[PDB]
């Protein structure tokens, strides 16, 4: 605390030091190349008296930056004014050796460290604590990888006398010099400093305080200008930081000075958020009367900023700054000689524009065929007329066809005038419609009538349609006949057909001089003219390779222009047709949960519907399990113009000839869900055959059948229990018995009988069908004398059944 020093620039040397008396700076201070002088003083001069710098600091090959050990530590930037949105930059040093300035927090601005010719100690400083600085992330090790340092109170020198924090997952100690480091404070005590002994400062502090819990020793300010024993413990009524408030008037003044600031820098701030911010959500606006953010009528209410009052657009990319705008203060000039696309680029940028104030001109362009890419424009104020007292000026657009579909758009201009010069491809009907819609037709009443569109067709007729038939992949078409006066001039027909998922399309909507070819074009040579025009064949054509279910769109002749008369074969009403439905394609890949014989459900709706998908069919042709081993003596464990001029020339010769040679005097079915359940079947990969059709009727159209095969668990289990009844023969022969509930579906996992002597190893033998059927029992192998135990077990894992061994003694020889 103490004196205040206004921020002034540093062609001199003695101004390199400015921390002598003023503990705070009222403006911006930065050091530059300055006088080329040896850093005799700066390499060792210590002046940590200043604690706060209000604005950003800049360095530009400052000679003084050679060695820094204890120059001025304990520096928390206020960030009132910023450079490149930075409140601190570390750049342009060509002879820096040691970085040991040793930093608590930089407010309102990031820190730049990249592209430094000479820097070090960057890997030993936690820049996250001072500020996250995630906006730029230019804080990188410029030359620490080559060990530019030459002076670390951590593990490098043994005992760690410095605080440590996680750096990129590494607990890197805070090393600045041989022994200096960053001040540490308890995590609860943040952004207001603490004393050496860890005692927290007051909540009104900014930086480390000499006296604990003493905001007077600090140099912080108060948002309500208390100017004394100020309080800044923000309650919920107080809307900047955890300890720094804005309440309701500081953030008011944050926008009050910028209310009339039609420039960069000063910007309006809103108090509606908990922390005073200059921005608002995408659907929220600064209130004109109130001082809290107000939701808009639509998303992105952003108004595009103006520069010099003219924001001309050319080659698409010049409009990139106009991604989203609402009202434009200045004037617009449009001139697009060429480009790649019209709607995908220019409508993608200028489509969202809503209203203009003043002037907008189409200066000179070729790519614009349809001007309707100005999708949402409603009102151009026209209070500022740029040239000729004009408001909207269309000029030098050779192939400009459509301004706006006037059945749809309601663009109105309050003030100004119009002009259409050198616009040869736009009929006067369209400009008349535009004037009617703009509201300046008559009200606030310059048309060339020759340079405007006269080389293209107008005063069009109507071409009616006729017979129509189609299949799933081939739509035909026949229309009424019509001939101009001199029938031979009519070169032919142009049929335009194009997809239409929804019943809303126009002609020039997806076209430009770039040739977007949204509407596929075909040409049909005229039919032979016949006497008795009723007997004439109806001019017809069909096209192939269509889609079987889409709502198609179709509709104009070609006329060689004659100077005497301007008559052209017109278009036809856009008639929407849909090819008849047909068989759908293969179903979506099925998913089967074949858990149990009673628990089998199928999960799939593929593309190419070819009609409303309604009928699903299912089948299954298989057998549960093999039964040959069930009955035979088998072991389960053992089983194994130029053309236009040519036409005109031919017509000319014909008319010369005639002018000179004539002189006067089972199965399953579901409906809308995937599948309810599949059951009734009996422990195998049951093959299930699934068929997808079109609709539920005997006239259903079904695709190839997808197939499903998945294994159920065996619903049957333990099968033999009870004591092992046995009979002992005098010649060391024993017998076995069991009951076999033979159900020929499934396989017993083990199916064997285990016999073990007393104190000896256990052996098992397989069980055969003939043991229960033919032999009516079983006999063990050679049994050594002694106590023997027999185990009978056959389970389709089993819970474990204590088969009674009923120990028996055999003959001892």
């Amino acid at each position: 605390p103490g004196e205040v020093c206004p921020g002034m620039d540093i062609n001199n040397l003695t101004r390199l030091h400015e921390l002598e008396n003023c503990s705070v700076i009222e403006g911006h201070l930065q050091i530059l190349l300055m006088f080329k002088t040896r850093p005799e003083d700066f390499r060792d001069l210590s002046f940590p008296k200043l604690i706060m710098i209000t604005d950003y600091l800049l360095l530009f090959r400052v000679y003084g930056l050679e060695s820094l050990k204890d120059l001025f530590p304990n520096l928390t930037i206020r960030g009132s004014r910023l450079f490149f949105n930075y409140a601190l930059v570390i750049f342009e040093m060509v002879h820096l050796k040691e970085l040991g300035l040793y930093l608590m927090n930089i407010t309102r601005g990031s820190v730049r460290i990249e592209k430094n010719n000479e820097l070090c100690y960057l890997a030993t400083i936690d820049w996250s604590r001072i500020l996250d600085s995630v906006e730029d992330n230019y804080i990188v090790l410029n030359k620490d990888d080559n060990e530019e340092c030459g002076d670390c109170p951590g593990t490098a020198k043994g005992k760690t006398n410095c605080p440590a924090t996680v750096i990129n997952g590494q607990f890197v100690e805070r090393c600045w010099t041989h022994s200096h480091c960053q001040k540490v404070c308890p995590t609860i005590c943040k952004s207001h400093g603490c004393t050496a002994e860890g005692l927290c400062c007051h909540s009104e502090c900014l930086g480390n305080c000499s006296q604990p819990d003493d905001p007077t020793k600090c140099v912080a300010c108060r948002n309500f200008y208390l100017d004394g024993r100020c309080v800044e413990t923000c309650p919920p009524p107080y809307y900047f930081q955890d300890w720094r408030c804005v309440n309701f008037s500081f953030c008011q003044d944050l926008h009050h000075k910028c209310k009339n600031s039609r420039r960069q820098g000063c910007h309006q701030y809103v108090i509606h958020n908990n922390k005073c911010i200059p921005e608002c959500p995408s659907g929220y606006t600064m209130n004109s009367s109130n001082l809290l953010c107000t939701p808009c009528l639509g998303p992105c209410p952003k108004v595009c900023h103006l520069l010099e009052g003219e924001k001309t657009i050319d080659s698409v990319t010049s409009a990139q700054e106009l991604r989203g705008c609402t009202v434009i203060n200045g004037s617009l000039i449009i001139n697009i000689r060429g480009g790649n696309n019209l709607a995908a680029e220019l409508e993608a940028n200028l489509g969202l524009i809503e209203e203009i104030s003043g002037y907008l001109k189409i200066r000179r362009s070729y790519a614009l065929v349809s001007l309707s890419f100005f999708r949402k424009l409603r009102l151009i104020r026209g209070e500022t007329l740029e040239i000729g007292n004009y408001s909207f000026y269309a000029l030098d657009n050779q192939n400009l066809r459509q301004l706006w579909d006037w059945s749809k758009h309601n663009l109105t201009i309050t003030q100004g005038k119009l002009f259409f010069h050198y616009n040869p491809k736009l009929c006067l009907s369209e400009i008349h419609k535009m004037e009617e819609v703009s509201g300046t037709k008559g009200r606030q009443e310059d048309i060339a009538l020759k340079t405007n569109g006269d080389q293209a067709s107008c005063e069009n007729e109507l071409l009616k349609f006729s017979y129509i038939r189609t299949s799933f992949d081939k739509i035909l078409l026949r229309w009424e006949p019509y001939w101009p006066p001199d029938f031979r001039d009519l070169l032919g027909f142009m049929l335009f057909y194009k997809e239409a998922p929804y019943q809303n399309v126009t002609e020039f909507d997806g076209q430009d001089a770039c040739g977007s070819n949204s509407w596929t074009v075909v040409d049909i040579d005229p039919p032979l003219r016949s006497n008795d025009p009723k007997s004439q064949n109806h001019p017809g054509w069909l096209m192939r390779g269509l889609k079987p279910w889409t709502q198609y769109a179709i509709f104009k002749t070609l006329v060689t222009f004659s100077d005497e008369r301007r008559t052209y074969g017109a278009k036809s009403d856009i008639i929407y047709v849909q090819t008849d439905a047909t068989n759908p394609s293969v179903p979506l890949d099925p998913i089967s949960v074949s858990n149990s014989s009673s628990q089998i459900i199928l999960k799939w709706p593929p593309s190419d519907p070819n009609g409303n998908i309604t009928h699903y069919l299912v089948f299954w042709e298989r057998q549960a399990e093999d039964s040959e081993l069930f009955e035979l003596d088998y072991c389960l464990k053992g089983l194994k113009l130029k053309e236009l001029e040519e036409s005109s020339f031919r017509k000319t010769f014909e008319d010369y000839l005639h002018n000179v040679v004539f002189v006067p005097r089972p199965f399953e079915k579901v409906v809308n869900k995937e599948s309810l359940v599949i059951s009734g079947l009996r422990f195998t990969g049951y093959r299930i055959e699934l068929q997808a059709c079109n609709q539920d009727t005997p006239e259903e159209r079904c695709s190839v059948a997808a197939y499903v095969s998945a294994r159920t668990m065996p619903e049957a289990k333990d099968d033999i229990v009870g004591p092992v009844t046995h009979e002992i023969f005098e010649n060391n022969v024993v017998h076995l018995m069991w009951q076999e509930p033979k159900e020929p579906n499934g396989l017993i996992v083990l199916y064997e009988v285990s016999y073990r002597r007393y104190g000896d190893e256990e052996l098992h033998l397989c069980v055969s069908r003939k043991h229960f059927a033919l032999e009516r029992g079983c006999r063990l192998r050679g049994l050594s004398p002694g106590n023997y135990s027999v185990r009978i077990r056959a389970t389709s894992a089993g819970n474990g059944s204590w088969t009674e061994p009923t120990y028996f003694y055999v003959t001892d020889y």
Binding site: D486, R488, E654, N659, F662, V663, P664
Partner: protein, 44 residues
């Protein structure tokens, strides 16, 4: 509005008496503006 090949057969369908006379014309008078029997027959 016959124009060209139609005008050929039109005169054949009309008269055979003088079979056209010989020693702005018919195309100007009849093609572009659809002449009638009056002047078209005159070219017999």
């Amino acid at each position: 509005t016959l124009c060209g090949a139609e005008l050929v057969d039109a005169l054949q369908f009309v008269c055979g008496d003088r079979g056209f006379y010989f020693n702005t014309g018919i195309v100007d008078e009849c093609c572009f503006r659809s002449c009638d029997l009056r002047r078209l027959e005159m070219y017999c």
